[PDB]
From a paper:
Recently, the nitroreductase NfnB from Sphingopyxis sp. strain HMH exhibited metabolic activity for dinitroaniline herbicides including butralin and pendimethalin, triggering the initial steps of their degradation and detoxification. The homodimer NfnB is a member of the PnbA subgroup of the nitroreductase family. Each monomer displays a central α + β fold for the core domain, with a protruding middle region and an extended C-terminal region. The protruding middle region of Val75–Tyr129 represents a structural extension that is a common feature to members of the PnbA subgroup and functions as an opening wall connecting the coenzyme FMN-binding site to the surface, therefore serving as a substrate binding site.
Next, we determined the crystal structures of the two single mutants, Y88A and Y88F. Their structures were found to be nearly identical to the wildtype NfnB, with RMSD values of 0.38 Å for 428 Cα atoms in Y88A and 0.39 Å for 433 Cα atoms in Y88F. In the Y88F structure, the side chains of Phe88 and Arg100 are well ordered, at positions nearly identical to those of the wildtype NfnB. Compared with the wildtype NfnB, the side chain of Arg100 had been displaced by ∼4 Å toward the side chain of Asp97 near the entrance and was found within a ∼3-Å hydrogen-bonding distance from Asp97. Except for these displacements, no other residues at the entrance exhibited any noticeable conformational changes. Therefore, the possible hydrogen bond between Tyr88 and Arg100 identified in the wildtype NfnB is not crucial for maintaining their side-chain conformations or for NfnB activity. Compared with the wildtype NfnB, the smaller side chain in Y88A and Y88F mutants exhibited a wider opening to the coenzyme FMN. The specific activity of the Y88F mutant against butralin was 97% of the wildtype enzyme, and it showed significantly enhanced activities toward pendimethalin (90%), oryzalin (47%), and isopropalin (14%) compared with the wildtype NfnB for butralin. In particular, Y88F exhibited higher efficiency toward butralin and pendimethalin, with a lower Km value than the wildtype NfnB, but Y88A was more competent than Y88F toward oryzalin and isopropalin, mainly because of its lower Km value. Therefore, even the absence of the side-chain hydroxyl group in the Y88F mutant unexpectedly caused significant changes of many enzymatic properties, without compromising its activity.
Numbering used by the authors:
A (entry chain A): 9 to 231
B (entry chain B): 9 to 114, 120 to 231
Write the structure that this text describes.
């Protein structure tokens, strides 16, 4: 399977089968992901990988904050820019309507759409959850480094018949997550990555995902 | 060429041939690179791609900043973290001196000079975004950028990501015709690798996974 294909066939998967992931596969995937580039070869990404009931502990501990409502939020950072303007603001809800479409939840059936969202905190039923973090000394370019490593991981997964879903939602409770995991407050939680076998006849995993056209992305000069 | 192979054979290339780059190829590459993920599918990345005489225009303007010594610097942001501790810096010098070893330099600005020539690449990509975007969105840009770099390799092209242009983000933003609504993250030199230049063949170190991955619940 080519890089193009893996890239074409990577999507955020929101339905995993109850099927385990070979730790040997993961370790091998990470060895190659480490070939990701980084400014100054700093390689600032750090990963805690949890499964079973270390992973169940996290879910429960965070679930205990979720029922607190907005009161229980412990944001590591601003997931989206406050006052995100209307260009980007459309892309966010644009896919939202594409994906709730796939499950059957009415457009302003607010109850049901929230119900699908909290599945986030089950890692959509993935057996393994990856927590990507780094030192609080790292700046935005180093966060870009982490993207590069993260995207590598997702492509290798696809290549080896596995799937994933990137999740910033856990940053809503960074401290709780960091606590359960045992990282200190020198560390900052960036994102989670639910890892597992995609349920490829779950409809939540088959609706076509939109991207904007290149005219909104790419400027050409000197040609 | 598989994704594993593509990752394995992507390196920062610092010697490009004069071989021109098919714009049709680049365009196709970007179309599929756009499939990279982004929090909320913001796809916050934007790119200005230059070759020819606008690309020479950018270089000339930055060189004018270079001759200024420290005065000509216009940092978009801070490339490496103030008070980066020497544990992490150890990685930088490990690879840095391995790379200065291959060229013979130890005097070193001559090599650093070559940066702003894009190591002789015919095409230079400038990745930027709105000043409103936060660090998660910068991670998004990373995901797109790594996508682009893997595709170059798969298609027989090569690249070098360059934060050095951020040393003059403002001058560069001017040449590109960008506003101060935008901030420059990085450059990406694009072209065919001069594949028997030795600076393109020395083995690049990575740390072991025991410094990287913690396993729990297994
Ligand atoms: C950093 C990051 C965080 C994400 N967090 C979540 C998340 O918390 N919940 C979720 O459902 N999807 C999350 N996603 C998935 C994105 O919505 C998805 O990448 C985008 O809509 C494109 O869809 P696709 O990846 O399936 O092509 C995240 C993606 C990224 C890059
Ligand atoms: C965001 C970013 C910016 C970079 N900027 C430069 C640069 O300005 N000059 C340079 O020689 N290398 C630059 N690099 C190359 C890194 O030094 C390189 O990725 C790492 O040192 C060596 O790994 P590699 O050759 O396998 O890519 C950059 C890499 C990244 C990810």
């Amino acid at each position: 399977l080519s890089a193009s294909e893996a890239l074409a066939r990577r999507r955020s998967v929101r339905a995993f089968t109850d099927r385990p992931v070979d730790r040997a596969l993961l370790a091998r995937i990470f060895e190659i992901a480490q070939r990701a580039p980084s400014g100054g070869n700093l390689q600032p990404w750090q990963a805690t990988v949890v499964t079973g009931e270390r992973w169940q502990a996290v879910q429960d501990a965070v679930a205990a904050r979720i029922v607190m409502g907005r009161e229980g939020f412990q944001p590591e950072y601003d997931i989206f820019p406050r006052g995100l303007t209307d260009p980007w603001d459309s892309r966010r809800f644009g896919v939202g309507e594409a994906l709730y479409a796939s499950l059957g939840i009415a457009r302003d059936d607010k109850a049901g759409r929230i119900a699908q969202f909290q599945q986030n905190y089950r890692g959509f039923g993935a057996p393994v959850m990856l927590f990507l973090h780094c030192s609080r000394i790292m700046g935005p370019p180093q966060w870009a480094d982490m993207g590069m490593w993260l995207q590598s991981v997702m492509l290798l997964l696809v290549e080896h018949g596995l799937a994933s879903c990137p999740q910033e939602c856990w940053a809503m409770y960074g401290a709780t997550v960091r606590a359960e995991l045992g990282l200190g407050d020198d560390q900052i939680l960036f994102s989670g990555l639910a890892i597992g076998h995609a349920d490829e006849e779950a409809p939540v995993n088959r609706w076509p995902v939109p991207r904007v056209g290149l005219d909104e992305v790419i400027d050409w000069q000197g040609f």
